[PDB]
Amino acid sequence: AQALNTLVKQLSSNFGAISSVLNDILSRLDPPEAEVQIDRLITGRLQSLQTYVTQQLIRAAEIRASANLAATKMSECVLGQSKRVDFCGKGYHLMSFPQAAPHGVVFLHVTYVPSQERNFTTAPAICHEGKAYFPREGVFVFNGTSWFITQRNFFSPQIITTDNTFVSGNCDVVIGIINNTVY
Amino acid sequence: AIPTNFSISITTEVMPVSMAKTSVDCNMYICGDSTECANLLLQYGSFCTQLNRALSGIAAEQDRNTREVFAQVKQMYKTPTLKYFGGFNFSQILPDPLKPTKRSFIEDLLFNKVTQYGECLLICAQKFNGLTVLPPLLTDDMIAAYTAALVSGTATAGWTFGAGAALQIPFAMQMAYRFNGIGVTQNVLYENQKQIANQFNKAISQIQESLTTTSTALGKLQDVVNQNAQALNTLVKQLSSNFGAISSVLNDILSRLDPPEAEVQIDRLITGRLQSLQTYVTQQLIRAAEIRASANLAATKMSECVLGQSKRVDFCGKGYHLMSFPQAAPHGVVFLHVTYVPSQERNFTTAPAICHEGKAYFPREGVFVFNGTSWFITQRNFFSPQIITTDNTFVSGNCDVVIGIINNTVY
Amino acid sequence: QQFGRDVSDFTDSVRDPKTSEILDISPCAFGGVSVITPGTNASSEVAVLYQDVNCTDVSTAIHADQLTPAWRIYSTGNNVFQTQAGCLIGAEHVDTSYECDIPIGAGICASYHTKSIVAYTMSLGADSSIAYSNNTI
Amino acid sequence: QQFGRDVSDFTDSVRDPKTSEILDISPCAFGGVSVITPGTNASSEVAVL
Numbered sequence: 001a002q003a004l005n006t007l008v009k010q011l012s013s014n015f016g017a018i019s020s021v022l023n024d025i026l027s028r029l030d031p032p033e034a035e036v037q038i039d040r041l042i043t044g045r046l047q048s049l050q051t052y053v054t055q056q057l058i059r060a061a062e063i064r065a066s067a068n069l070a071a072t073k074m075s076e077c078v079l080g081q082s083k084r085v086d087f088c089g090k091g092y093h094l095m096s097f098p099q100a101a102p103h104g105v106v107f108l109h110v111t112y113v114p115s116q117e118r119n120f121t122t123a124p125a126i127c128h129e130g131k132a133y134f135p136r137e138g139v140f141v142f143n144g145t146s147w148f149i150t151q152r153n154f155f156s157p158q159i160i161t162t163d164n165t166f167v168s169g170n171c172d173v174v175i176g177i178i179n180n181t182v183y
Numbered sequence: 184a185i186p187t188n189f190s191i192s193i194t195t196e197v198m199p200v201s202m203a204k205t206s207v208d209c210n211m212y213i214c215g216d217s218t219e220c221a222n223l224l225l226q227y228g229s230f231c232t233q234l235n236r237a238l239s240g241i242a243a244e245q246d247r248n249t250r251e252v253f254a255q256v257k258q259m260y261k262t263p264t265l266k267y268f269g270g271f272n273f274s275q276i277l278p279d280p281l282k283p284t285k286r287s288f289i290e291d292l293l294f295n296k297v298t299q300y301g302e303c304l305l306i307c308a309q310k311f312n313g314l315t316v317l318p319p320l321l322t323d324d325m326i327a328a329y330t331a332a333l334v335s336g337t338a339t340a341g342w343t344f345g346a347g348a349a350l351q352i353p354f355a356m357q358m359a360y361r362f363n364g365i366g367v368t369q370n371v372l373y374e375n376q377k378q379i380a381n382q383f384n385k386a387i388s389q390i391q392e393s394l395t396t397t398s399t400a401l402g403k404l405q406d407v408v409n410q411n412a413q414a415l416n417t418l419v420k421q422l423s424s425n426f427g428a429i430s431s432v433l434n435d436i437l438s439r440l441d442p443p444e445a446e447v448q449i450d451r452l453i454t455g456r457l458q459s460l461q462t463y464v465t466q467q468l469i470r471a472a473e474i475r476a477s478a479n480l481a482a483t484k485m486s487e488c489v490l491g492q493s494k495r496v497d498f499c500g501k502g503y504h505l506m507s508f509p510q511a512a513p514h515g516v517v518f519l520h521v522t523y524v525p526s527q528e529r530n531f532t533t534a535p536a537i538c539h540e541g542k543a544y545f546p547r548e549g550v551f552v553f554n555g556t557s558w559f560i561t562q563r564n565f566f567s568p569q570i571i572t573t574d575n576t577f578v579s580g581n582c583d584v585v586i587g588i589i590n591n592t593v594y
Numbered sequence: 595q596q597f598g599r600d601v602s603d604f605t606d607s608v609r610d611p612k613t614s615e616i617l618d619i620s621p622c623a624f625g626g627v628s629v630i631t632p633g634t635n636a637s638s639e640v641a642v643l644y645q646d647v648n649c650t651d652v653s654t655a656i657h658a659d660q661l662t663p664a665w666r667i668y669s670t671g672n673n674v675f676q677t678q679a680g681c682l683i684g685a686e687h688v689d690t691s692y693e694c695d696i697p698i699g700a701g702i703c704a705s706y707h708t709k710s711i712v713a714y715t716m717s718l719g720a721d722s723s724i725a726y727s728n729n730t731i
Numbered sequence: 732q733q734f735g736r737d738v739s740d741f742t743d744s745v746r747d748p749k750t751s752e753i754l755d756i757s758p759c760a761f762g763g764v765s766v767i768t769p770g771t772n773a774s775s776e777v778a779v780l
């Protein structure tokens with residue numbers, strides 16, 4: 001809008017010519033004299049006109065930044081699930097609902113947010129009968145009662161069995177090997 | 184060809200995210216403090232209304248680019264006391280509190296290889312030219328504070344800091360999960376945790392001596408300063424253009440010549456300088472659209488590369504990235520790259536499946552590598568002889584649907 | 595040598611034609627004006643910022659009526675504080691920190707607390723610490 | 732009052748100087764033309780807009 005009110009308000013400028021209405025330049029001045037004062041009004045009205053094009057032309061490429069964002073952030077986020085860092089909301093994105101906006105779009109990203117944390121004491125390795133044992137996925141979790149396995153988003157116990165234990169290598173080499181009983 | 188022995192080194196990535204915001208008063212650029220210029224100026228129209236809407240619209244966007252890159256952090260985490268994390272020497276990267284700098288050892292050398300218009304730096308002085316360079320929103324101490332809370336907090340919380348609340352984790356537990364990203368086992372970290380840490384301690388020592396000795400690795404940040412210098416001086420030297428007048432001096436044309444000789448040549452030098460002012464305003468407006476690009480390569484390589492770990496090839500580190508280190512710098516960001524570069528491969532014989540019981544046996548991961556002696560399963564990022572068992576391989580179809588099955592037994 | 599010039603091409607130093615005393619010529623002070631308001635629904639008071647200027651000359655020229663523009667009903671209230679952005683005149687300096695609401699520059703923001711318009715240094719965020727505990731998650 | 736203006740400086744409506752009726756002014760017509768063609772290969776008729 002304020003690009004156009006730049007443009008409309010430059011009609012009423014005199015541009016250093018005799019007047020800002022052509023039926024007041026042609027009226028008073030005689031046609032040898034008037035047509036040189038019309039030329040400074042035409043050139044004044046063209047150089048604000050071509051500048052309006054260039055200000056529209058740069059602000060057009062400001063949107064192709066944001067239109068190739070929204071072409072991706074719809075065709076990677078609604079049409080899939082985004083596995084990126086704070087792309088599509090903050091947290092772990094699950095769905096996305098795009099809406100339609102005047103001269104733009106509206107997204108509705110739904111994220112997964114972890115909560116309600118609690119410490120424990122950890123361990124990277126178990127010494128079970130001469131070997132060092134390693135986690136397949138998770139860490140060695142000791143809540144004061146027993147040693148078990150959980151995942152890094154939800155606290156839920158897993159019995160340390162050689163199903164879900166990365167069995168490799170000898171004991172007493174790795175930093176932090178804790179004498180437990182793997183079942 | 185599968186490796187067994189890799190390297191960790193550090194690669195510097197350098198980006199600018201902001202340039203120097205300026206502003207221009209017309210009545211001392213255009214008129215040069217003459218009265219009749221301003222009388223002639225108000226007859227052109229209020230065009231300096233719009234020419235300080237533009238250089239405010241850029242100057243308000245150099246605040247966002249400095250703020251959208253660095254101020255991703257919710258909580259300013261303190262610098263921890265011990266800076267030695269299982270052999271990982273974070274001394275040169277977090278700032279040393281003994282200095283009166285609030286800067287790390289890296290950042291001090293960055294300022295000393297990078298190192299006309301009014302400014303108020305305190306001594307405030309004006310110029311005859313109406314060119315001012317206003318100072319930014321975030322001073323360099325605030326910039327060196329978001330840097331320090333991105334390496335303090337990530338040394339104690341890792342990817343959780345970008346995931347959610349900055350949950351504690353040992354940093355040796357941290358790097359091992361960052362081997363789990365690139366398909367590389369926990370035993371690659373823990374067994375090798377001495378010389379993993381001691382290449383990385385000397386890889387920082389390389390970047391020290393590479394930046395104490397020379398420069399021009401910061402060529403991008405130099406050129407952001409150079410394009411500031413030219414566009415001001417071209418705006419300076421076009422003051423001295425005659426533009427068809429008898430001189431470029433509005434007060435000689437005022438005082439020395441006739442009043443009919445004046446207004447002819449006042450009206451020349453304004454229309455000359457006015458559209459030389461608009462060319463400057465336009466070329467700042469284009470140059471501030473490349474910064475808005477290269478401050479979004481930094482607001483994604485500080486989202487994706489610093490908080491998470493990136494699954495993107497040759498993006499924030501050649502090879503497989505592990506961790507990223509932000510730094511402050513004059514007008515921009517200097518990244519460091521913990522990269523997984525495998526090395527020293529040998530030749531191995533592969534084959535599609537096992538022929539036992541007249542049935543095909545399909546692996547879940549990797550290949551089947553012949554030792555010269557034995558068949559076993561490994562992955563292609565380090566040599567790892569895991570033996571073919573009953574659950575690391577599964578079954579569908581008979582033999583010889585694969586071309587070149589092994590007469591083997593699933594053990 | 596009669597006179598001096600700067601790194602630009604206007605003269606800023608002169609040897610005196612009468613008594614040969616080597617002088618400096620700095621131009622007169624000038625700059626932009628901002629206005630910091632909290633909203634007409636909020637209030638009807640404002641505090642103005644004068645950009646890139648020394649508070650010695652600005653606070654002087656207000657009382658001596660030397661500013662173009664000049665206001666009909668305005669006075670400083672004796673609140674002049676120098677930032678690197680310029681002489682913020684009309685707001686109350688406060689020694690605490692908060693989050694930024696209306697920016698000024700060089701780490702200074704201003705807002706509308708107990709009501710009046712106040713100015714302060716930014717707080718970068720919540721302060722915290724994380725233990726580096728050798729076996730804890 | 733004798734004649735009205737719009738938000739620009741153009742007098743978009745006047746009153747009759749003789750019979751005091753207030754009359755709008757309308758910019759009789761203008762506009763662009765575009766040519767909607769199937770291509771000169773497949774046809775030689777057009778349609779203007």
Ligand SMILES: *[C@@H]1O[C@H](CO)[C@@H](O[C@@H]2O[C@H](CO)[C@@H](O[C@@H]3O[C@H](CO)[C@@H](O)[C@H](O[C@H]4O[C@H](CO)[C@@H](O)[C@H](O)[C@@H]4O)[C@@H]3O)[C@H](O)[C@H]2NC(C)=O)[C@H](O)[C@H]1NC(C)=O
Binds near residue numbers: 305306307648650
């Ligand atoms: C805004 O303008 C005001 C005035 O126009 C200005 O305040 C002035 O600051 C200077 C220093 O910046 C002061 O000068 C000092 O005055 C003391 C006491 O009179 C002297 O002892 C000082 O001498 C020391 O410094 C000299 C130069 O650094 C050394 O050569 C010398 O050996 C001494 O170490 C020095 O002369 C001056 O008094 C004030 N004047 C007033 C009226 O306040 C202020 O700095 C300007 N601010 C900005 C941002 O431009």
Ligand SMILES: *[C@@H]1O[C@H](CO)[C@@H](O[C@@H]2O[C@H](CO)[C@@H](O[C@@H]3O[C@H](CO)[C@@H](O)[C@H](O)[C@@H]3O)[C@H](O)[C@H]2NC(C)=O)[C@H](O)[C@H]1NC(C)=O
Binds near residue numbers: 190378381
């Ligand atoms: C696999 O790669 C690693 C590193 O790329 C190689 O480790 C290097 O081994 C040599 C020994 O051949 C080390 O040299 C020795 O270092 C000790 C340090 O205590 C020093 O006291 C000795 O006098 C000697 O200089 C070298 O330091 C070490 N590299 C690093 C970075 O520490 C390893 O040899 C490679 N393996 C193969 C099979 O190539």
Ligand SMILES: *[C@@H]1O[C@H](CO)[C@@H](O[C@@H]2O[C@H](CO)[C@@H](O[C@@H]3O[C@H](CO)[C@@H](O)[C@H](O)[C@@H]3O)[C@H](O)[C@H]2NC(C)=O)[C@H](O)[C@H]1NC(C)=O
Binds near residue numbers: 274288
């Ligand atoms: C972790 O890295 C830091 C580098 O920041 C190591 O600090 C360095 O330690 C050496 C050994 O003391 C210092 O060399 C000595 O410095 C003193 C200080 O004046 C000097 O008198 C001696 O002649 C010698 O040069 C070195 O300067 C120092 N580096 C810095 C920047 O201070 C630190 O030792 C590393 N950690 C471990 C456990 O090694």
Ligand SMILES: *[C@@H]1O[C@H](CO)[C@@H](O[C@@H]2O[C@H](CO)[C@@H](O)[C@H](O)[C@H]2NC(C)=O)[C@H](O)[C@H]1NC(C)=O
Binds near residue numbers: 144146148
């Ligand atoms: C620590 O976790 C274990 C599970 O891994 C919890 O153990 C169970 O607790 C329930 C309720 O007390 C008992 O009925 C079960 O018999 C326990 N199972 C085992 C194997 O011990 C334990 O309660 C947790 N610790 C605390 C303090 O809640």
Ligand SMILES: *[C@@H]1O[C@H](CO)[C@@H](O[C@@H]2O[C@H](CO)[C@@H](O)[C@H](O)[C@H]2NC(C)=O)[C@H](O)[C@H]1NC(C)=O
Binds near residue numbers: 127171172179
């Ligand atoms: C966990 O078990 C290992 C088993 O190897 C322990 O290592 C033994 O340590 C004792 C003294 O600490 C020695 O007398 C034994 O000879 C070691 N075992 C072997 C097989 O040599 C280890 O000490 C245990 N952890 C802790 C904390 O005691």
Ligand SMILES: *[C@@H]1O[C@H](CO)[C@@H](O[C@@H]2O[C@H](CO)[C@@H](O)[C@H](O)[C@H]2NC(C)=O)[C@H](O)[C@H]1NC(C)=O
Binds near residue numbers: 528529530
């Ligand atoms: C892996 O195999 C390649 C080719 O199969 C080997 O490269 C050849 O090495 C011989 C010397 O032993 C040369 O004469 C050939 O010209 C090489 N050929 C090519 C294409 O490079 C390579 O040396 C082997 N490497 C290992 C570690 O086994």
Ligand SMILES: *[C@@H]1O[C@H](CO)[C@@H](O)[C@H](O)[C@H]1NC(C)=O
Binds near residue numbers: 118119725727
């Ligand atoms: C976790 O431990 C830290 C220090 O070890 C302590 O400050 C914090 O209160 C603990 N939180 C919980 C939920 O146990």
Ligand SMILES: *[C@@H]1O[C@H](CO)[C@@H](O)[C@H](O)[C@H]1NC(C)=O
Binds near residue numbers: 557
């Ligand atoms: C593989 O071959 C090497 C040397 O040929 C030998 O030392 C090693 O024991 C073999 N491993 C297996 C699992 O056959």
Ligand SMILES: *[C@@H]1O[C@H](CO)[C@@H](O)[C@H](O)[C@H]1NC(C)=O
Binds near residue numbers: 589590
């Ligand atoms: C494997 O055994 C089958 C069945 O005897 C035979 O057809 C095939 O040729 C053998 N593979 C090789 C490489 O000889």
Ligand SMILES: *[C@@H]1O[C@H](CO)[C@@H](O)[C@H](O)[C@H]1NC(C)=O
Binds near residue numbers: 635
């Ligand atoms: C002024 O602000 C209050 C704040 O709640 C709001 O309720 C009220 O609607 C606002 N006034 C108008 C006219 O909207």
Ligand SMILES: *[C@@H]1O[C@H](CO)[C@@H](O)[C@H](O)[C@H]1NC(C)=O
Binds near residue numbers: 176728
């Ligand atoms: C961390 O644990 C390892 C092994 O338990 C030990 O060598 C090291 O000294 C410990 N560091 C601290 C700071 O407690």
Ligand SMILES: *[C@@H]1O[C@H](CO)[C@@H](O)[C@H](O)[C@H]1NC(C)=O
Binds near residue numbers: 748749750
């Ligand atoms: C002029 O006179 C006619 C009748 O002769 C009348 O209808 C009209 O209103 C008059 N207009 C003015 C402007 O007096």
Ligand SMILES: *[C@@H]1O[C@H](CO)[C@@H](O)[C@H](O)[C@H]1NC(C)=O
Binds near residue numbers: 772773
């Ligand atoms: C021209 O039109 C004919 C059919 O009308 C079509 O087969 C041909 O490909 C067209 N060629 C071009 C250059 O348009």
